[PDB]
């Protein structure tokens, strides 16, 4: 985690990823794919959790 | 402080931070982290104090 989620408990802003490690381009799209898919998995499997959505 | 902190002493408005000085995007992260830890440290050391929470 880079920063606590609770700017305010109601925030709908997405838990935007912040890559480090000298990303090129293909690594950016890959991280975004993994990010959205991991979001989908936690959605489908553990709906109650949302920690990946807003942090 | 920008305008008076007595703008509404009853008002629970967040103390907005408005940083200046050609901040890096990471500097904004360090600064918001600074505001948060300042609030945390202030509760750790001077709980009665109320600037950072409401100024």
């Amino acid at each position: 985690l880079r920063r606590p989620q609770d700017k305010d408990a109601k925030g709908d802003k997405d838990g935007s990823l912040e890559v480090t490690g000298q990303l090129g381009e293909v690594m950016k799209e890959s991280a975004r794919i993994a990010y959205t898919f991991a979001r989908a998995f936690l959605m489908q499997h553990a709906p109650a959790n949302d920690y990946l959505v807003t942090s």
Side-chain angles (χ1 to χ4, degrees), chain A:
Chain A
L1 174 62
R2 202 260 308 291
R3 202 268 312 296
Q5 74 292 20
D6 197 358
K7 280 67 66 179
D8 182 54
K10 197 177 291 301
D12 62 356
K13 296 298 99 185
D14 53 5
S16 293
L17 187 138
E18 295 91 4
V19 64
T20 59
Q22 186 252 308
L23 73 166
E25 180 70 352
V26 302
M27 283 311 80
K28 159 58 178 148
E29 77 176 12
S30 314
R32 199 72 200 278
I33 297 153
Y35 171 36
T36 47
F37 173 58
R39 187 171 272 170
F41 194 113
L42 185 139
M43 282 178 139
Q44 189 280 329
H45 159 275
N49 181 349
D50 64 357
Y51 173 45
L52 178 52
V53 175
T54 81
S55 61

